[PDB]
C-alpha cells in the first residue's frame, strides 16, 4: 500500500492489471483478532418432549443387506439406473 504513485503506475502498467484494487497483502480490512463471544445454536434433538431416542435412532435403522439372489415371462431388460442425462454446455462461459 505504501508504494508511491510512480511505482504504483509502473507496476499497473507492467502487469496490465490494476493491482491496488486487489492487493495480496492484507491490511485493516481483515477481521479483528479479538472477537465477541459466540452463542452457538443447538441441534434439533435439544427438546424436552417428543424426543425419544428410539424415534430418531439412526444406527438401529440400518438393516442387513437384502439377499436378492442366493444359491442357498418376457421380462424387460434392465440397466443399473436410467442412463445419465447428457450434460448441457455452460450458459455462463462455454468457451464458444
Amino acid at each position: 500500500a505504501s508504494a508511491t504513485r510512480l511505482i504504483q503506475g509502473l507496476r499497473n502498467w507492467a502487469s496490465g492489471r490494476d493491482l491496488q484494487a486487489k492487493l495480496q497483502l492484507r491490511y485493516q480490512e481483515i477481521s479483528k483478532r479479538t472477537q465477541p463471544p459466540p452463542k452457538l445454536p443447538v441441534g434439533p434433538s435439544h427438546r424436552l418432549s417428543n424426543n425419544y431416542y428410539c424415534a430418531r435412532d439412526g444406527r438401529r435403522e440400518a438393516m442387513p443387506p437384502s439377499i436378492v439372489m442366493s444359491s442357498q415371462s418376457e421380462k424387460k431388460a434392465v440397466s443399473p439406473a436410467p442412463p445419465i442425462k447428457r450434460w448441457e454446455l455452460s450458459q455462463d462461459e462455454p468457451y464458444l
Binding site: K22, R26, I30, S31
Partner: protein, 52 residues
C-alpha cells in the same frame, strides 16, 4: 496457499492436518470473522490465477 493454511489453522488449530471434518459433521464451529476473511481471500484470488 499460506493464507488458506491460515484458514485451516483458524478453524482447527492445525495448518495442514486438521482432523476437522469428522463422521457426523465437523469438529467445531467456525470462529467469528472467518467467513469475512474467506471473502477477502476469494475477492482477490482471481487476479492471482490470472497472473499465473
Amino acid at each position: 496457499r499460506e493464507k488458506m493454511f491460515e484458514f485451516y489453522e483458524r478453524v482447527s488449530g492445525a495448518r495442514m492436518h486438521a482432523a476437522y471434518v469428522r463422521p457426523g459433521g465437523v469438529h467445531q464451529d467456525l470462529p467469528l470473522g472467518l467467513m469475512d476473511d474467506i471473502y477477502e481471500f476469494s475477492k482477490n484470488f482471481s487476479l492471482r490465477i490470472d497472473e499465473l
